[PDB]
Every structure is written in C-alpha cells, then in structure tokens.
Amino acid sequence: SHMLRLSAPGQLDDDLCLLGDVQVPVFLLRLGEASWALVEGGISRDAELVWADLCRWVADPSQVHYWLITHKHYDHCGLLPYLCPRLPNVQVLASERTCQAWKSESAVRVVERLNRQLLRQRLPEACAWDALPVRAVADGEWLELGPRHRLQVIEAHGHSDDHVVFYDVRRRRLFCGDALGEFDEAEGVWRPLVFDDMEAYLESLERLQRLPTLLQLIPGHGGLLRGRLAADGAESAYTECLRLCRRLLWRQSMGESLDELSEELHRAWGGQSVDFLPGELHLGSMRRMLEILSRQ
Ligand SMILES: CC(C)(C)CNC(=O)Nc1ccc(NC(=O)c2cccc3cn[nH]c23)cc1
Ligand SMILES: [Fe+3]
Ligand SMILES: [Fe+3]
C-alpha cells in the first residue's frame, strides 16, 4: 500500500509485468510486437501459476526469446527445467558460474531438494538441468534484447559467488536480484543477505551506487521500488549492512554467541520468506551470514 513499492501481479510499466507471486516473482518484458523476455527464475512449484500468468499476456509463447537469471540459488532458477520445455525459442542468459552450477550434479541436487520442500501437487515434466538452452554472459556484456531494450550485465558478487545484476540504462532500471538484500516491507529498509562474502557484497554495492541515478529498482523478491527507494537503494543497502556488522560486534563484545543474534534475526526477519523458504533454512542462513560478517 506504499506508493513507492509496486507489489501486485500484472502490469507494472508500459513494457513490464509481474508474473506469479510477488514474493518470488518472474518479470515479463515486452521487447516488440512478437518478442518477450523473462527476468528471474523463481521456485519450481510456481511453474503452473507463472505459466498461467504468462499465457494471459503472451498469446504465442514461442515469442519468449530470452530468460535472464541473476544467480543460482534455488529460489531464482527453480522454474527453468519446468517451463523452458514450453518455451521452444527461449535462451537462458546467466553468468559463467551460474551456468556451471547447472552442470554440477551436486549443486542441482540441492536446488531440487529445496524446491521440492515447497510443493503443496506434482511438477510438469522437466528437461535436464544440463540440457537447458543456456548462453553464458560476461561481466560488462551488453544484452541487445530488442530495439528498445539494451541491458548491461554487471557482476555483483557477495550475496553469492555467481551473482549478477542487469541494468536497463534507457529506463534507469536495475534488476538487482538479492545483491541489496531483502527489502523490509513493514519498515522500508534493506535487510542484508550476505551469504557468501561480505567484502565482495559491499564492493558490489559501491559500484552499483555509481550507476546513473535509478528510477526503478527490482530485487529478487517483493516487487518494484521507485522514487527515492530506487535512487538511494544501493547506498541504503550498504548502510544497513554496516549497521548489521556494528550490531554483531556490539553483542559479541558482550560475550554473546552467534546463535543469539541468529535467533533474534530469524524471529524478527523470518516471517517475510516463510512461503518460499523453510524456517530452518532461514535461521541457518542468518547463522551463516553472521559467521561471514564475524570473520570479515
Ligand atoms: C547454491 C547451491 C549449492 C546450488 C544450493 N542452492 C541454494 O539455493 N541454497 C540456498 C539459497 C538461498 C537461500 N535463501 C535464504 O536463506 C534467504 C533468507 C531471507 C531472504 C531471502 C531471499 N532470498 N533468499 C533468502 C537459502 C539456501
Ligand atoms: Fe539468493
Ligand atoms: Fe532469493
């Protein structure tokens, strides 16, 4: 209900729709009269929901030509095996390390296990992960998606070691995945998601702050941010991460164990993701983040 946060399914801009669940959304870009792209790859159990929404906008799904992926986490690529078979002309665009994850039997195994925990139903017939129609893309690569859509790949490691963002400079629009963290709907601030490397996470935010002023900021969860939330997004995310480090140091300096802020963080932050993230995994991830901050 905040005017700066668009969090409803359907049309978001002249060229853009939100498909599926706002908390794990798939974004639809209209590239031309007969060309479309998807951005973010969701959770597996949403295959039929997202497919249903897609077909309400796109009369012929063979016109879906690209599918852009920020990182390899199970909640950002779980749909790929289940929907790519229904998209004969789609090319999945992911970073090198993200593509490597789909060639790893053990990595794919974790992804499938996490996604099956979210099943209420049984999944569509899936192609193999290693058989996905992928094309690796590089840091700085320009994605000429259509006559009015040129997006630059920008490496944004720290949340995960493969993470990238996509920047539409015509629209000052950044698809930032989880590199800024989890947007707090009740409080209007970023919650950090430092799950791989704090130093890389903070350096990505420094670089993203140097982009031309954002008009639209589109993370991996929660919808589209605009106004000052977009303009100040990368900076605020940086600030909130330092705020979490200071908090961690304060408590450790009082002899607290990492388990204590972990439980408080899980209590205070675990509610937002309970529909796509098992509660033990949220607590575990909070523990892992504090471990990462504590070292670095
Ligand atoms: C990468 C592989 C080896 C291939 C295994 N694959 C995975 O996907 N592991 C995995 C990924 C993400 C999460 N997430 C979170 O804990 C979390 C917590 C709060 C908000 C948000 C918003 N997004 N995520 C979160 C947990 C485990
Ligand atoms: Fe993630
Ligand atoms: Fe995520």
Author numbering: -1 to 118, 121 to 296
Show sentences the authors wrote.
PqsE has two biochemical activities, a protein–protein interaction with RhlR, which increases RhlR transcriptional activity at target promoters, and an esterase activity. Curiously, RhlR function additionally depends on the metallo-β-hydrolase enzyme PqsE, encoded as the final gene in the pqsABCDE biosynthetic operon. With respect to RhlR, PqsE is required to form a protein–protein interaction that enhances the affinity of RhlR for target promoters. The effects of the PqsE E182W and PqsE NI substitutions on pyocyanin production are not through impairment of PqsE catalytic function, as the catalytically inactive variant, PqsE(D73A), remains fully capable of interacting with RhlR and driving pyocyanin production. These results indicate that PqsE has two independent functions, catalysis and interaction with RhlR, and it is interaction with RhlR, not catalysis, that is required for virulence. Moreover, the RhlR–PqsE interaction is essential for P. aeruginosa virulence phenotypes, and therefore, of interest as a focus for antibiotic development.
However, if the morpholine ring is removed and either a phenyl (BB583) or tert-butyl (BB584) group is installed, a modest increase in binding affinity is achieved (EC50 = 71 and 34 nM, respectively). Within that context, BB584 displayed the tightest binding to PqsE and provides a starting scaffold for the design of new derivatives. We determined the crystal structure of BB584 bound to PqsE, which showed a similar orientation in the active site and similar ligand–protein interactions to those observed in the crystal structures of PqsE with BB391 and BB393 bound in the active site. Specifically, the nitrogen on the indazole ring of BB584 bonds with the Fe2 atom, displacing a water molecule that normally resides at this position. Two additional hydrogen bonds exist between BB584 and PqsE sidechains: the BB584 amide oxygen with the hydroxyl group of the S285 sidechain, and the BB584 urea oxygen with the backbone amide N–H of residue Y72. As predicted, the tert-butyl group tucks into the hydrophobic groove that sits between the α-helix consisting of PqsE residues S104-L116 and the backbone of the conserved 69HXHXDH74 motif. Analogous to the structures of BB391 and BB393 bound to PqsE, no significant conformational changes in the protein were induced by binding of BB584 (rmsd of 0.24 Å for 293 Cα atoms), possibly explaining why none of the three compounds disrupt the PqsE–RhlR interaction. In the case of the BB584 ligand, an atomic model of the ligand was fit to the difference electron density observed in the active site of PqsE and refined with partial occupancy (0.93). Thus, it is not surprising that the compounds do not affect the PqsE–RhlR interaction. The crystal structure of the PqsE-BB584 complex solved here provides needed information for launching the structure-guided design of the next generation of molecules targeting the PqsE active site.
